[PDB]
Amino acid sequence: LYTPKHEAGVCTFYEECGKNPELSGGLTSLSNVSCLSNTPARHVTGEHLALLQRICPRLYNGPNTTFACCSTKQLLSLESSMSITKALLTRCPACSDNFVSLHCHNTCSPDQSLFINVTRVVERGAGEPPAVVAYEAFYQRSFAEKAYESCSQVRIPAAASLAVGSMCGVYGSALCNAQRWLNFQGDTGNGLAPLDITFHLLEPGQALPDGIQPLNGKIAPCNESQGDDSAVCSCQDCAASCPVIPPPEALRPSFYMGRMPGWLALIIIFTAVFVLLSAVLVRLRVVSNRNKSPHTILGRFFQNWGTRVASWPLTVLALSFIVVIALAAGLTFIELTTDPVELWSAPKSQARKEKSFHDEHFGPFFRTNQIFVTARNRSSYKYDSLLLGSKNFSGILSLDFLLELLELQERLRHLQVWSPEAERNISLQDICYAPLNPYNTSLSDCCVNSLLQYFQNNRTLLMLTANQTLNGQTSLVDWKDHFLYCANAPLTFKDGTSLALSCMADYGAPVFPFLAVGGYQGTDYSEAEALIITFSLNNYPADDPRMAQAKLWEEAFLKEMESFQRNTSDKFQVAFSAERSLEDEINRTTIQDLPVFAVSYIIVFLYISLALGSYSRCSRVAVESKATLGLGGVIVVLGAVLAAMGFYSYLGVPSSLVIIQVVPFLVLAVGADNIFIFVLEYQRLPRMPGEQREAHIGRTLGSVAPSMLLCSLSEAICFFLGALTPMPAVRTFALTSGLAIILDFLLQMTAFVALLSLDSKRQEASRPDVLCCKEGLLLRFFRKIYAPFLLHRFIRPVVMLLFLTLFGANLYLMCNINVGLDQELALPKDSYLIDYFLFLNRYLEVGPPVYFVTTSGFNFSSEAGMNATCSSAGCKSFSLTQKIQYASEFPDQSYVAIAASSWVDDFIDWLTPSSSCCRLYIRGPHKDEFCPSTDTSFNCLKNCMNRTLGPVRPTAEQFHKYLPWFLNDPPNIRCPKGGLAAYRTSVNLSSDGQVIASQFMAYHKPLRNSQDFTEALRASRLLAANITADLRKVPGTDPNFEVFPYTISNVFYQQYLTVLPEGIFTLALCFVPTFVVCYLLLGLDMCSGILNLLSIIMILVDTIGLMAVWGISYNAVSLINLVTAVGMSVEFVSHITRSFAVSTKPTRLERAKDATVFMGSAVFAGVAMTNFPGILILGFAQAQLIQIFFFRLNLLITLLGLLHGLVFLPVVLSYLGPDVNQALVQEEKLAS
């Protein structure tokens, strides 16, 4: 049972006996145990020498000597046994050779007795040698550590982990040293080691037992080539052969313009424009001090128009109603598009072109339905685990919680629905994603990720306990030791803690700890706060019928999860989501709060009716109010709204939630201003003796029509210019609003003028109006209280200083601008998805995957093509997957956390003849056809390719012939690599076997804010451009070959890379024709134009500043609201400014006083008080996009408009206003 003598030249065993009686089980075919024989080494010649030279190249010692101690049977058994490990480690030949060197030194070395002590045997009967079942081996520490370190970084791209992580048992790749690695190699409990070998890594200073000396042989270093191999390992594979480059500085972040922040550019632009305009305006004032009729043209035209309209009022009302009904009739063809991708992004953007390419070539990205579960009040605890130290465990990991979650998951898997179209029950196995067995799938094949997958969703295995004696002490093993083992080493076929439990999921895939649990730091997997249950379903195109079935199943999923959410509030806090939830939640409340909004029309009707009358009695106001004109106003507004929506429905343009819930109420806030001002001016001007009411209304319309035309044109032009946004919802909003404003103006100049004529006709008869069968408080208040106060000599410099202070303060506050909109922001206030997004932001440890997709034009069959893509030994440095690996080493500068997988490296590795993966039938019915790795017959002794002196590279014919076999070969214990699961959907093959498109999957780091999605997009695009530029240098590459980074979030966040240049350019385009129309229409006074433009700039800057303070981010929706501000503020500025300009008072102060009282009262009572019921009613929206971006911004715009129009502007007109237009002075004097 031992080796009595071990001087030199002798070995401890030679012939291979039968099977090992002790283990009895295994994963694969094992290796028979050698029989003990202490005997001098054998003289190895002939074919035995050829076998030795091939199997163990570091034992051949000359042509004619080569003493060794193993038979041909042991050499063949060793060659069979190491095929799996060689299949994993062949990427770095130095590592493969070192591992094989260790095994063939143990098995066949002629100096076997110098380091091996046999300790335990089993007798095989009298006259027979006993078989060896346990022994120990002695090595130097430096030898084993160099051998380990040469293999320490070899990677498994398909699993995105280290190969050493599958070879160190309970210790993962993070905690594995040479001792643990060698202990795993000798541990028979894993189902792989044929016999028990104890490894002593005896140190050199240490004194050793009698004749034993530690082994110290040759170890191939990482970076050193051996002979003429030229197969030096790349540093992705061993981390010792690439030059050191200091970590790259991060790139200039998006939301920065040029070399400076975007807000700094905003301050520079607004300040420069303001100071230039102010300097020019004051220059004109001092020039006027040194110096000590288009209005009539439009007046005459509008008087003729008004008189014709007043002449025939019933006919024009008839045509107005006919046109309004004819346009509104288009609502029968209305179509609503509810998908987020369609509204959020343009159909011909860059991200959508990439999305279309990916979806066409590889299929759409699968639908992910997730559940996050945490523990409400359970405390943590300790567990004295086996093979590890004491481990803290979280409260959520309590066994009863896992049992009820197992009941939940199993209940969800067996959920079935009725399909009205298919006329059958749809179960999970009909629509689920399945990486293994895609066709003829079952429930056991569906992709479902959870912690419970470590126990293959089997209740009996979860509750199992076992007795294990380690270090001489018997203890108890339960599910927690399997959990810790799998969390550290997820690539385990068999656990060693007395339980033969696979660590793989039931559908055949490893479950990585970041996919099962979350809420941890470092490698403290047992402390995880939240558990994650993920269902992945196949996606399809929207038109395809299968999508409806998937949506029905997800609906049942949502109802079941709401049931389990309500049922157990005493144990868990649960967040959950479904793929269709985002589409359902955003569009849920379009209709629900619309009758709540409808009260604004009633409030506007009542305000217009009461404000224009209801006086002198306060008890007969029911008949003295102007009910007819209120009804007219509200009908004109509704007419414009319905006509605009109808016309766009007639052109096939769809509508959305930004149309239904916003457009009638913003148009309500705008449209009634012009008629309120017109009616007030009608009441104020007295009639001349002998004049008819038609001429009076004509003269009134001639008086006020240029300003109403100015406001309508300015707002309509601003909305149409605001339609340049790439976002379709905002584009549709802008076009609908523009058309509604134009049609509103056209109805105001025809139907309302006619209605005022008919109401005046009724008024002259001193009769009650249709429905209800020379002073005023506004003018007295403004004349006696407001105007003596605002224009007082001790007020005007204070108002000037206060408003310039406010402007400067808002320019400062403009620095705090957020760019981008969070997903939560879109949701309704009470949606369950808000909890889901909070749980994702706190508990996931990885982000979404990113696929670097290569288009057609790249020859993957050429050796130059393979070398510019692979990352194994002999591949070119700075290759595609090595660039991705390098980007993955610095996750904060480039938002990639997990290195890419690659079909090329696994294909080349699979083709390797030494890996026993690609075999051909040598004889029989299927001669020269593919022999699967699971065929255990003797018909498959011919490898796919021949042996080589370097890396394995096929020719073009071999590449095209063998690639469809690789892409359909399922992985198993015999061959780990294969493309059925990981790569079948990642390569597109045309019928001549050509590669049309290909993708390389990698994972982002967790992304939480809009800034993280935007920066991840920028860094990922920069990496893909860097890959594309170097791939284009390979000869034969098409000039239109590119690599692009598809991920599902790109179509939502692409727009935030350009939103600032587009927003600034759009605002400047809004400012230019506004100035042009107010300059040209009001009589070509440069002073008045500059005054209006400066006021609009101040209102806009104040709006942006206070927006930044409040916490409203900048995006396309805020942009269209600021465009609305630029348009709308003309209604607060232009009327007062024109009233000042058209005035005959000799001094600036008197003109400021009279313009302030008359038009200030009209502007206040009309514009402000009409704006409030519309805008304020959106504060009950319950959809956060409207509550935040439409209510708050339009409210701020209205208040700043009122503040600037009524307080600032009269004072500025008093100081810096235009001089007197002498043509009206002469007109007043001559006609006097």
Ligand SMILES: CS(=O)(=O)NCC#Cc1ccc(N2C(=O)[C@H](CC[C@H](O)c3ccc(F)cc3)[C@H]2c2ccc(O[C@@H]3O[C@H](C(=O)O)[C@@H](O)[C@H](O)[C@H]3O)cc2)cc1
């Ligand atoms: C020998 S050692 O010394 O080195 N140390 C011990 C070791 C090891 C080791 C080596 C390689 C790996 N993998 C890669 O590489 C593989 C990485 C991922 C792989 O692409 C994959 C497979 C399926 C899938 F959906 C998604 C991805 C992994 C592997 C997994 C499963 C597998 O086969 C399945 O197994 C299931 C089961 O057993 O339950 C059966 O149900 C299925 O039918 C059968 O297809 C073979 C290899 C993992 C562990």
Ligand SMILES: CC(C)CCC[C@@H](C)[C@H]1CC[C@H]2[C@@H]3CC=C4C[C@@H](OC(=O)CCC(=O)O)CC[C@]4(C)[C@H]3CC[C@]12C
């Ligand atoms: C006077 C103010 C307060 C409201 C006038 C505005 C109208 C222009 C709105 C109010 C009611 C809306 C309609 C009410 C509900 C629907 C049904 C809707 O169809 C669905 O609900 C299907 C939704 C789905 O399939 O998810 C299509 C839009 C439509 C016609 C809306 C079109 C726009 C309308 C007529």
Ligand SMILES: CC(C)CCC[C@@H](C)[C@H]1CC[C@H]2[C@@H]3CC=C4C[C@@H](OC(=O)CCC(=O)O)CC[C@]4(C)[C@H]3CC[C@]12C
């Ligand atoms: C008269 C015109 C010029 C403006 C009138 C509009 C006000 C009604 C707005 C303008 C600024 C707003 C404030 C800006 C800042 C905030 C912080 C905001 O919440 C935060 O971002 C801080 C909360 C936290 O995270 O601690 C709560 C609303 C509030 C008080 C806003 C309350 C409403 C205010 C006073």
Ligand SMILES: *[C@@H]1O[C@H](CO)[C@@H](O[C@@H]2O[C@H](CO)[C@@H](O)[C@H](O)[C@H]2NC(C)=O)[C@H](O)[C@H]1NC(C)=O
């Ligand atoms: C080789 O292994 C044998 C088997 O254990 C060792 O023999 C035992 O050594 C211990 C050490 O004190 C003694 O107490 C036992 O009496 C020995 N004999 C047995 C178990 O039969 C032997 O010492 C080892 N030799 C070397 C060089 O390490």
Ligand SMILES: *[C@@H]1O[C@H](CO)[C@@H](O[C@@H]2O[C@H](CO)[C@@H](O)[C@H](O)[C@H]2NC(C)=O)[C@H](O)[C@H]1NC(C)=O
């Ligand atoms: C292979 O890598 C090693 C380590 O990066 C290189 O450098 C050796 O580094 C050790 C540690 O300081 C020194 O003791 C050796 O003298 C260094 N040189 C050699 C030749 O071992 C080594 O140069 C690299 N070899 C090649 C060919 O690149």
Ligand SMILES: *[C@@H]1O[C@H](CO)[C@@H](O[C@@H]2O[C@H](CO)[C@@H](O)[C@H](O)[C@H]2NC(C)=O)[C@H](O)[C@H]1NC(C)=O
């Ligand atoms: C591989 O890519 C081709 C196109 O390069 C895909 O073929 C298209 O498939 C869509 C439907 O999926 C058809 O509408 C197109 O007409 C097809 N075009 C051509 C040129 O054939 C093919 O489907 C992709 N492979 C897979 C498996 O989806």
Ligand SMILES: *[C@@H]1O[C@H](CO)[C@@H](O[C@@H]2O[C@H](CO)[C@@H](O)[C@H](O)[C@H]2NC(C)=O)[C@H](O)[C@H]1NC(C)=O
């Ligand atoms: C859940 O796990 C148990 C293991 O305890 C499985 O039960 C074994 O099934 C095999 C195959 O039929 C039998 O040979 C064993 O005798 C069973 N063991 C016991 C204790 O009954 C069980 O099949 C698993 N569940 C499923 C659905 O496969």
Ligand SMILES: *[C@@H]1O[C@H](CO)[C@@H](O[C@@H]2O[C@H](CO)[C@@H](O)[C@H](O)[C@H]2NC(C)=O)[C@H](O)[C@H]1NC(C)=O
């Ligand atoms: C990719 O490159 C390989 C060679 O690098 C091309 O294979 C050649 O194909 C032509 C076509 O008959 C043969 O005449 C050559 O002899 C082949 N060369 C070799 C080395 O085998 C292959 O055609 C290229 N791919 C494409 C799509 O053109």
Ligand SMILES: *[C@@H]1O[C@H](CO)[C@@H](O[C@@H]2O[C@H](CO)[C@@H](O)[C@H](O)[C@H]2NC(C)=O)[C@H](O)[C@H]1NC(C)=O
């Ligand atoms: C891809 O990125 C790498 C690293 O960022 C670039 O390599 C550097 O390029 C600059 C010039 O752009 C050189 O001055 C440096 O010497 C290069 N090396 C290093 C280590 O910084 C590479 O050029 C990029 N590819 C392209 C096509 O621009």
Ligand SMILES: *[C@@H]1O[C@H](CO)[C@@H](O)[C@H](O)[C@H]1NC(C)=O
């Ligand atoms: C292994 O042992 C079994 C049983 O003794 C025997 O049938 C088989 O041929 C042996 N194989 C090798 C390669 O030694």
Ligand SMILES: *[C@@H]1O[C@H](CO)[C@@H](O)[C@H](O)[C@H]1NC(C)=O
């Ligand atoms: C479909 O499932 C429901 C679930 O209760 C069941 O009642 C019904 O009979 C099933 N239909 C078929 C055809 O299996």
Ligand SMILES: *[C@@H]1O[C@H](CO)[C@@H](O)[C@H](O)[C@H]1NC(C)=O
């Ligand atoms: C494990 O051993 C202990 C100690 O005798 C014993 O009490 C317990 O029942 C054993 N467990 C099983 C499952 O047999």
Ligand SMILES: *[C@@H]1O[C@H](CO)[C@@H](O)[C@H](O)[C@H]1NC(C)=O
């Ligand atoms: C829900 O909770 C009740 C007790 O609150 C329990 O009896 C029941 O089994 C739970 N599950 C279902 C599906 O009702």
Ligand SMILES: *[C@@H]1O[C@H](CO)[C@@H](O)[C@H](O)[C@H]1NC(C)=O
């Ligand atoms: C690709 O790498 C192999 C490595 O052996 C080399 O032989 C071959 O010449 C390389 N091809 C090119 C085009 O450099």
Ligand SMILES: *[C@@H]1O[C@H](CO)[C@@H](O)[C@H](O)[C@H]1NC(C)=O
């Ligand atoms: C190389 O491979 C080819 C085809 O697989 C085969 O015909 C040939 O015999 C092999 N060996 C040599 C030395 O060419």
